[model samples]
Structure formats: C-alpha cells, structure tokens
Target: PPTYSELQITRIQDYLRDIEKNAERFADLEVSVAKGDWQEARNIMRGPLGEMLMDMRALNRNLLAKDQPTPTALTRALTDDFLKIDQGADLDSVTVAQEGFREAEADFKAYLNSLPEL
Candidate 1:
C-alpha cells in the first residue's frame, strides 16, 4: 500500500473521528425513538438532517444527468448522508439506506477515483 503523508493521514484520522461521532449520536437518537420518544427523535434530526439528505439527492441528480467531472460537492454530500443515517435507524432500515448510499457513493467515487491521483 502507498504510504500517506502526515497531512493525508491526519485528514483520514479526522474523517474517521467525525464518522464515529456521528454514528454514536445516531445510535442514541435511534434508542430514543425506540423508547417511544418519536417527537424527540424527530427533533434530533429535523432541519440540518433534512438539508443533508436533500443535498445528497441533488448530487445524485447531477450524476444521473451525466454531469462530467464529479465534484467534491458530490462526495461531501454523499458522505454527509452516510453519516446522517449510519446509526439512527433499525437494522433493516439501516441496511436499505446503506445499500442506497453505497451505490451512489461508489458511483461518485469511481468517477473521481478514475482520475489521476493527486
């Protein structure tokens, strides 16, 4: 495997930390919902969460429309969606969401990953 420089390593570490944090928060929210605090759980992910998901959908539209040169916007949007749902639902829900996000993300990643490594 190619060794990443210090900055690249740091970036990956930071990304992983954020993913972990989001997962924990989502798990807590799921439990709250399961405990019948539906209103509280919904409140936990109302505004910003909706926006993140909307952004992901927009990115998918761009991809489907054959917009060339996949942008970082697409990557970030999909990553945000992944983080947003990674922990907040039951296993079945999460599985479906994961498959959807993974397909979209992989498509975007394949586009960028095909480019010359920077």
Candidate 2:
C-alpha cells in the first residue's frame, strides 16, 4: 500500500471526480453548438476540455511507479481528437462537431480505462 500514500489517493480521486465534471462540460459544449454559439463551444473545448488532458497525463503519472516511462499514447489521441472537434467548432460545422465529439468521447473513455488502479 506504500506505493501510494493517503494524499496520493485523494489526488487520484480528485482527477477521477473531474471525469463527471468533464462530462458536464461536454454537455455544455453540445448546447453551445446547438445554439450556434461557435465561440463558446470553442472555449469549452479549449478550456475545460484542454485542462482534462493535462489531468489525464498527471493521473497516468501518479498511477505508475517511479522509473516507468509515462506512455502517453492515449493522451495524444485525445489531444488529436480535441483539435478535430475544435476545428469543427471553428468552422461552425455541426456535422463535423458531432462526429468529432463522438470520437473525442470515445477517446476520453479509453483514456480513463487506461489508467492503472492505485
């Protein structure tokens, strides 16, 4: 159990709880898209959505033991999807946004699943 300390556990939970928050952020993003507010949607994607990727990487680091090379292949994929979705919003294309959002959501799920249990 020493592999992870108490505060470490809390930190893990902190990131885990953000999972729900990010989901809500996505919902807000969808609303913005529907309302044709391209700017707000883009802000959500680049702001909340952007920060989640950092947390995802940090979560990955915290879950792994020292000396392990953090394999961020999953995070990179999510980053790629973010760009796609942001581009969709920039162009004011709902079709692209929908398609891009779905892929990003899938990537988000995969990233969460990829983290090792502490």
Candidate 3:
C-alpha cells in the first residue's frame, strides 16, 4: 500500500467530497427528468453538473500525480457516465444514465473506503 502525505490525503478527501456533491446533484437531476422538468434538468446539466465533470478531471490529474490507479479509473468511469447523461435528452436514456451514475458513485465510495485514513 502506498502511503500518502497529509496534504495528499486532504486533497483526496476534498475530491471525494466534491464527487459526492455532484452525485447528489445528479440524483436530483434524475428526479427532475422523471417529473418532466426538462428546464431544471438542463439547468443542472449546464451548470453545476458540467462544473462537476471539469472538477473530476482536475482531480484525476492530482490522482495521476499521486500514482493512484484505482481512484483515477473510478473518476474516469464517473465522468464518462455523466457525459452520457449530459448528451442524452430522452427520458429512457436519462433513466439509464441515472443508473450508471448511481453505480459509479457506489464504486467510487468503495474505492474511497479502501484508501488509508487521512
């Protein structure tokens, strides 16, 4: 197991927090879509949702710097799942995307738990 400095651990923790926040937003977006609230869903996707994807990519850069493969892959998968949702306008596809998002979040949480404590 690789040991992380306090600073690195803090950064990773922040990354995880951000990921969770975005995941929550995604869940809300899923509800919005289900209720046929297209405008709210679009607002989320164009606003915080897009920002979250960018943040995830930035976090991946830090993960790469730390040589953390598992977290990096998890981040990539989450980002890809978000991209799918962002590009899909139909209800069925959005529902599937929501499932993908939930799966990504679950996998990411597991990865985070497997890491050493800060």
Candidate 4:
C-alpha cells in the first residue's frame, strides 16, 4: 500500500470537498428537472452529467484512500471510464455536466501525474 504525503492527503481532501459540493448541486438540479424546469435543470443538474461526475467522485475516493497505492493501470482505467461516460450522453442539457465531470477527471489525472510510483 502507498502512503500519501501530507500534501497529497490535503489535495485529496480538497477534491473530496469539491465532489461533495457537486453532489449537492446535482441534487438541486434533479429537483429542478423533476419540476419540469428544463432550463433550470439544465442550468443546474446536468442529468447524465451528474451521474458521470458522481462516478468521478467515486474514482477520486478510490485514488485518495491510503490503503491503496495509486496504480497507473487504474488511473488509465478511470480515464477511459470518464471518456465513455462523456461519449454516452444523449442530450444537450447534459453537456455541461459532462464538461464538469471531465474537468474533475482531468484534475484527478493531474493528481496521478504528480505522484511518485509506489
């Protein structure tokens, strides 16, 4: 198992916080969509985009855990998953969310790039 440097731990914690914020945003967006406020929903929720963001959050959690060393193969796997999620979107309203998810994925990839091999 790889141990994170204090800086890495702090970065992970920050990423976790950002993810939580996104989840809250998703909740709000889902509600707007349910209420038939497509514009509002599109502005906030991002639909399938929210799902992709949540998945990235899961990946962030997995990467940041101290019990596992960040693996190159796993990082690559995550990158592929992110792309798949983005490519699967079916609506214009969901594009922004996909963008957000991709941004997070990019951030995580940058994080991985900064790490020393375990």
Q: Pick the candidate with the highest lDDT.
A: 2
Error of 1 at 35 (Å): 3.6
Residue 52 deviation, candidate 1, in Å? 10
- Could you give the candidate ranking by lDDT, starting with the highest? 2, 3, 4, 1
Prediction RMSDs, each to the true structure: 9.7, 3.0, 3.6, 9.2
Residues 20-89, candidate 1, lDDT per residue (tens digit)?
A: 3443445545554456454555554554434434443443333322342454455555555545444434
TM-score of 2: 0.77
Per-model TM-score, in order, reads 0.34, 0.77, 0.62, 0.41
Ranking by TM-score: 2, 3, 4, 1
lDDT of 3 by residue, 34-74 (tens): 66566787788778767766666666555534555665676
Superposed by TM-score, candidate 1 places the C-alpha of residue 103 at a distance from the truth, in angstroms, of: 14
* Residue ranges of candidate 4 with Cα displaced over 4 Å: 46-118
Per-residue accuracy of model 2 over 1-118 as CA lDDT, tens digit each: 3477777778778987775577679788777877778888878877887777777776666664651233367778878887887778778788887777788778777766666656
Instruction: Go through the candidates in order and give each one's C-alpha lDDT.
Output: 0.45, 0.74, 0.64, 0.50
Q: lDDT tens digits, residues 2-104, model 4?
A: 6666776666666556644555664564455344455665554355545545554454554545434554444455445444433433344455445545554
Report lDDT (Cα) of residue 65, candidate 2: 65
Which candidate, 2 or 3, would have the higher lDDT against the true structure?
A: 2
lDDT of 1 at 110: 56
Please estimate how well model 3 matches the true structure, expressed as its whole-model Cα lDDT: 0.64
